[model samples]
Target: HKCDITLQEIIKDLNSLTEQKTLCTELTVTDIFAASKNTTEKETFCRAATVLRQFYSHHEKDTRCLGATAQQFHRHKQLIRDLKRLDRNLWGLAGLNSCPVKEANQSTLENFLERLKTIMREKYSKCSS
Candidate 1:
């Protein structure tokens, strides 16, 4: 069966995910004097995981009706698996003690996710085609 797709719902959620505050303060670019002390990589990963978690949460409802062929469904399955894998990494905190993320770092992560949104726009267009 051909699936009809409309990214309207997912799009709304994506924008929200970017704006939503996170719990990982450790990933914040600046905190008072300097509360964060993790390695750069850890800092980055924790920040990503934090928003990525929100992305996943929003997707819960946004993807309730994802349009996809049988294979597309399979991809979603694997996608969930992979996302969860990253979720558990570094105790899902990128070895950081907390989230909220840096001002610039938040921008950095959201911008990256927006890139993914662009790809989704292309991939999941009108679906009427």
Candidate 2:
């Protein structure tokens, strides 16, 4: 089916592929942090964040997948609250002003993962999509 009959169909198929590609990028990010961090973890994290930002930003008008409607940021309040809490907890105490050094690493990671699990309870803990 190299030459499709309808132009619209081809466009839609390619668009869907693009959406899938973005999703794969997201998965790559999830894997990077969740699994072992290699030499490229930092770069992978940055790229993942960038891709997620783009995904949420242009999700609506991509015309490949169902984009957000007008003011349709109706994300679950509990999940949103949990996400905020996670962000605050992690980014809040990251550097020189961090908490107790002895347990900071373990405790912070645990807390981050706990809040993340709470926010992501609806979905599988491991898989992104």
Candidate 3:
């Protein structure tokens, strides 16, 4: 048997996962000057983190979830750290350079969403089987 779950439902579930927490709570420490420049990237990262956390939380309660949930969680945390550090490193030169474009951040966000859909698809397959 196959499971029927929509991508939208998964995304909605993830978004609701962090509803109680303010966006600021998930933010990483960055240079004050760079903070503004990195806002969009940071927001995207935060949303991804919260969504991953939600997936982990739901899977953690099930033995059938295997170990992917924990792995995904760790990856999410690491990505947040990486993005924060990258923003700081790049933004430090704000005075000497223009604010970086959002293309990189947008690419990362798109990659994450694709990965999320794949993960949910796998989960549904595993659970259904």
The lDDT per prediction is 0.44, 0.30, 0.38
Ranking 1 against 3 by TM-score, winner: 1
Query: Number of clashes in model 1?
Result: 10
Worst 10 residues of 1 by lDDT: 24-33
- TM-score of candidate 3 relative to the true fold: 0.26
Tens-place lDDT digits, model 1, residues 1-129 = 112232444444444444432232112222211235554544654655665665555553344423257855554454444445545542333457575554332333335555535643554564546
Error of 3 at 35 (Å): 22
- Model 2: colliding residue pairs: none
Error of 2 at 127 (Å): 29
TM-score of each: 0.42, 0.25, 0.26
Candidate 3 residue 76 C-alpha distance from true site, Å: 0.2
Q: How far is candidate 3 from the true structure (C-alpha RMSD, Å)?
A: 15.9
Off by over 4 Å in 1: 1-40, 90-93, 102-129
- Cα RMSD to native, each candidate? 14.6, 17.9, 15.9
